[model samples]
Target: PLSKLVVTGERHYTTNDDIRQAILSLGAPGTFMTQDVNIIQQQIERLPWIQQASVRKQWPDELKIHLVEYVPFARWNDLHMVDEQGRSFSVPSERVGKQKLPLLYGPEGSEQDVLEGYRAINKVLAANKYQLKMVAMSARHSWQLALDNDVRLELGRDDRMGRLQRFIELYPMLQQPDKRVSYVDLRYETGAAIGWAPVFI
Candidate 1:
């Protein structure tokens, strides 16, 4: 007797209405009680925002569904959002219309690589009180970064971490009152090239 269907733990992207519709789409009421819960579980999991789901009978007359939605980590490729696991999902723009998440771009099938790189770079940036606005990996595997302060960094394919560390060591100089660095190229083994913004009087 499936008189009631309860869904829980949906906050950011998925909606209760969507979950209800998904359950209803399984065809009629009480049928779910007899049917394999896995069947309904699979249907619910297909929803774009739901990453994991658990379905169970709540005794006599109700079915309870618990949903775990994907935690949006960053915008991917301008069209989709990625979770911590690097799985991409898309939702109506209106849902995340005002959120300011970091943007990450990479060649096809490189989501995991991009995410890992972001995490590693973000860790160092965070420790230095810097925030990453975007991170990109070109088709040739070269990496680049944009900081929230409008500073761009080119961390070419070779020894990127070392290059980044080199930049971190010089970060204090970049923070000087009159120094406005537009970009820093960290491709050289012994030194880096910093491009300064023209001073306008």
Candidate 2:
């Protein structure tokens, strides 16, 4: 009888219960050790978090599953996750667990662009104390960002790179440890301001 299946490979977000449930839902694979494993393979692949699934018969009575999982680089539109290559997939929100991926949300079909935005922003941010963490794109607007320090940086709909450059020029004033800001609305085109305490000089 095919009573056991061994799973192999490193995992970041997948669990045994997920694969087991995938197989169990399909009912039992036949007792013949050499039978086709197509159903098992397809079912396991159906899992959105899974990149690829392999099922094979081990010599006598054992079965095996070799797994390759998607590395989720960010959450998309608060409803899905995407790989570094920008392939999007949806899963139960609870599955995000402890190892958190940065949040990226925007209009439909914006997944790819949002990640691209982050890559460039992070590239420019490499010399800064803050890292580009989350990004949101609004309708009728080009972009915005949340730095790792919990401060949001508003990059308006045009000349985004230029606007961010200006912010970089102005960032030194905020380096003081005595204040906190809610956002930097770079859209205004000149100067900087902080919310909640109104610090702009």
Candidate 3:
């Protein structure tokens, strides 16, 4: 009852060759009517880059597959890629090296929470036209960030948002072209400490 297999909607991040290799192995030709679509879906979804997939029999003759690949949001722990939904998946290190996405790190199974924090901080930074190149959470639950300009922010566990806000308020002064800030300590409630890099001749 099966005539052909059709795959579609995989325009970015996923190569057609890979998809074909996955689907074709299911032995689609004459095994159509008896083929379990759900089983096929599971197999396709097992591919590292695939985020979501759908498998359907197109009645009379064709087996149709629709796929949506994960959009890389950031690098995770220098070992994997995390998607917008905070799901971590692996790809070749060489492929990861070619991407310019920000890096994020946290304890195991805390990816979603870290991603949430990253998004929140990014929203705050975007207001000042600043972007983060990396965000990290320590085993002690402390937070820190490195801006695209290489300025580091040490945001301790408590009052994280308040500290970030205070830093944003003072960001303009630190933004001066020649004023190179090495890092800012936001552990104090009354005021924060800024560390300026030593200038060299």
- The prediction achieving the highest TM-score against the true structure is 1
Write one digit per residue (lDDT tens) for candidate 1, span 1-201: 335667677567766666666656756556455564664566546467677777787676677777777788898888788987788877786756587899999998989989999987899988877888999999999998888778898888979887788877886674566768889988878798989877677
Clashes of each: 0, 0, 0
Top lDDT prediction, candidate number: 1
Error of 3 at 56 (Å): 2.3
Using all chains and alpha carbons, the TM-scores for the candidates as numbered come to 0.83, 0.80, 0.81
Candidate 3 regions exceeding 4 Å error are 1-4, 23-34, 58-62, 94-99, 174-179, 199-201
RMSD of 1: 3.0
Q: What digit string (tens of lDDT, one per residue) describes model 3 on residues 1-201? A: 325667777556566566556656765455464555654566456467777777787887777777777778898897788888888787765543575789999888889889999888888888777778999998879888898778888898988887778987875664555668899988888988989887777
Q: Rank the candidates by TM-score, best first.
A: 1, 3, 2
Per-residue lDDT tens digits of candidate 2, residues 9-36?
Answer: 7766678767556666555556333343
Better of 1 and 2 by lDDT: 1
What stretches of model 2 exceed 4 Å from their correct place? 27-37, 93-96, 175-178, 190-201
| lDDT of every model, 2 decimals | 0.78, 0.71, 0.76
